[PDB]
Design a protein around this ligand. Structure first.
Ligand code: CL
Ligand code: CL
Ligand code: CL
Lengths: 118, 118
């Protein structure tokens, strides 16, 4: 049934963003983020398993956190001592536990974009 | 000297996003957000005073939080009971307290993008 997935594209270089660290949180009632998963993007900028699947899918507010400065510094980027982008949180809601939520991230060290894809 | 500003564009309607609620946080060393300012966007989707003025600027990590579902709901959007986008956090670093930082946001209820402006 339901599924959550992501796909990270490096727009500075025109490649998938491989070997990027990402964490998934569920934002609790209190507002406190509960860590669900730590993952790494594969060679195609995706994950080898869905972020959420089947019974894991629950309606609510979630947040993905992407380690973008780490990725770009590894790739050779020269960033400021305090980078403009370091950790990027993408906060979003899941309304349909049976829905397929695909959330791509396009990123450079000084810009990013995201959307509900398909 | 330095300054922090924002500019919100509603890409679902092709207009500046006026009357959107936004808050600015400084992220402390501990990781806990400290609220610095609450603001409302003006007719041009900007703020009537800078988010941070010269005297207020400090290097470090910041986060703007945009109340996007409230904005779009008022404009008549058909959102899910749990909206795909509700609060959007934009986390970024300031490396130079004398620098001019612009953080524009482009947003629809199902997409957004941001970048370090010039
Ligand atoms: Cl930088
Ligand atoms: Cl701006
Ligand atoms: Cl929605």
């Amino acid at each position: 049934m339901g599924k959550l997935s992501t796909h990270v594209l490096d727009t500075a270089h025109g490649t998938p963003a491989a070997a990027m660290r990402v964490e998934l949180y569920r934002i609790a009632a209190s507002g406190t983020p509960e860590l669900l998963k730590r993952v790494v993007t594969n060679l195609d900028g995706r994950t080898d398993a869905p972020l959420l699947s089947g019974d894991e899918m629950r309606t609510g507010i979630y947040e993905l956190q992407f380690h973008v400065a780490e990725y770009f510094e590894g790739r050779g980027a020269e960033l400021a001592h305090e980078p403009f982008l370091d950790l990027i949180p993408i906060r979003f809601g899941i309304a349909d536990e049976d829905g397929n939520y695909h959330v791509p991230l396009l990123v450079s060290p000084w810009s990013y974009s995201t959307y509900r894809g398909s």
